[PDB]
User: Fold this.
Amino acid sequence: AALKAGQMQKLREAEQSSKRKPLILPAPQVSDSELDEIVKMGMIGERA
Amino acid sequence: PVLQHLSLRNYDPVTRGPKLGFEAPPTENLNTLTLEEKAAALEAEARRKAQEEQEAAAQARGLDITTLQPKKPNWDLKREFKQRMAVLDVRTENAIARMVRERLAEKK
Amino acid sequence: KQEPKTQEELEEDAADRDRRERELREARELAER
Amino acid sequence: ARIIMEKAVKVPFKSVNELADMWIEWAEMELRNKNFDEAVRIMAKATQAPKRSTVDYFDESLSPQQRVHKSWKLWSFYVDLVESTSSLEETRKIYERIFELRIATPQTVVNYANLLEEHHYYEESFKIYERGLDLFSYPVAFELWNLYLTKAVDRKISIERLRDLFEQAITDCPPKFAKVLYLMYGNLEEERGLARHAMRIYERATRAVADEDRADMFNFYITKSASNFGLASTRPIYERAIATLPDNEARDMCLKFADMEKRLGEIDRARAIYGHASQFCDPRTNPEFWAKWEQFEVQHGNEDTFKEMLRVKRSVQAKYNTDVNFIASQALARSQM
Amino acid sequence: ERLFIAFARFETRQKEYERARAIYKFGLDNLPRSRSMQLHAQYTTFEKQFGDKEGVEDVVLTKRRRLYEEQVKENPKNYDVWFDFARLEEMGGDPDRVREVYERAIAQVPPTQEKRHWRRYIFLFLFYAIWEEKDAKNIERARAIYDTCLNLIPHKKFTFAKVWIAKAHFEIRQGNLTAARKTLGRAIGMCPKDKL
Assistant:
């Protein structure tokens, strides 16, 4: 029973590499230009 | 005479045969740091550094300005710039030095 | 304790030292000629 | 005595090690009586074979008088005697005879270069390391690569030479050495090169490492990208790691990605990340992830998102009601007790 | 190429080293570049395995130059690869090759008006000018390169104070204090910067 289930879980793992719906990440509400704006404002503050 | 007329690098006189690298590897005789135990050092360094940032994030309320951008981009290009400056600023300060000398020559 | 930062010169490869010695010997031979 | 032991050399003993013992005690008799050059001549007479000798050492059908030049005992004691007595040129000649005879060992290659390094011939030591690398295929050749790359970064040769040297080393490596090899090529690109170079090398290192240590390689890549650039640069590493990794490691990477997005504050993206993780997680086999999602929802969420998380939990739990997944669930349930 | 590979490795196995060098060189001469990459790689292995320092450096330089050219043809926007190829040419010691590589990198202008792309292009221009001044010793060429960089700099959009500082340092090294003051005044009028 253990070996038969080992074969079954090998087939399940073979299925596991193809059923992956890809991670459609949402667009962030902030873009990297504003991130750089935050970086240089914080740099100005810490330099002051 | 054997231990002063044999270099003891390839012959093992106790077994009346050659040295066994299986028994005695040359990896323990280096005065430097071999390539296997380094990168284990790098993995350990990254590991305890990473637990340091996760505990710093746990103890803090949120992001600081030095944890999302620890250093400004194109920093290594600037590192190359100052390693050229290591002689460029040397003869630049020699330049400003001797122009100080003639400027002091006309002001006197 | 601070380690003693002695002027550890880069140990030149003996091929380079032999090249310098050969150049010096060639210069001496040219001067003799 | 020399006459009768010359006759002993003429005796065809049963074992080649016996005639080896004859030759080594001949040189030993000579070195006790302060005849080192004579001993060198004696064992030069011992291993007299042409440049094209290929006889089998273990072939118990030829006389041991001829299949003794390929005995490692004579050659080892001989080259120690030459090293302790003669100059560097003769020892280099004798090692060259070793490498021609095709009986050399990785230990012998390391001994060649250590002899050169004691005499400060570093470039020829590099030459004999990579000659040994040419002779030995690769699961043998990892040790030579360790010593050679360590000494090459010790001497600090030209940067393009080191780049081509690691590209030679990485070429056909097993993953189990690829981890160390890529770790130092990225390390050297950080130390004496450019940062984006080291980033792309860590990327293809994640691409070309073993399955068991791929997750730790993405961990090193993530930590180095965070220490190097912004976390916005670390996002594409994260969704690539979700795309390529197996389910458990993808779960761990997805949880860390959700943690980073919650740290940045864009919890809508973190909620989508948690939804994807819930799509490839089982409630009755992985309860800690659902507990973490509920914790994230009670810190950041509402009753509508909580109802959505109940709906997704019920749908996923209904989806995984297959026979094999029930078998796995009961197996782990009775395994933890 | 595998015929030349096996023949050269055989003559290596017979320890006729110069003959193997002859096979390798003849193969690298009378073959196309697209069908000798394996031959070139085995030549580099043989040369830095058995040759001298100058030959090993030459073979590694040829292989690295070919690889960098292939990478540049694959993606001309990789300014890091262009900088590495320029550094390899500078270490090689060929001034014509260095000038050609600098001109080829200068021709690849940055299309986007981003600060990072402009910074990378300005850093490449500064490195090329520093290589021209330190090695080629052509002060007029360095001044022309600085003038071209200043003309190509979109000062109405983003100003690079480092380029102006480098031009002022080069003028101070050249002794033209009045020209340096005029350049500093023009830069301040175009864009006054706190670092400047």
Observations:
- Chain B is about 55% helix and 5% strand.
- The interface with chain D takes residues 1-2, 4-11, 16-19, 21, 26-27, 30, 32-36, 38-39, 42-43, 46, 49-50, 53, 57, 62-63, 68-70, 73, 75-77 of chain B (CB under 8 Å).
- The longest helix of chain B spans residues 75-107.
- The helical segments of chain B are 2-5, 40-59, 65-68, 75-107.
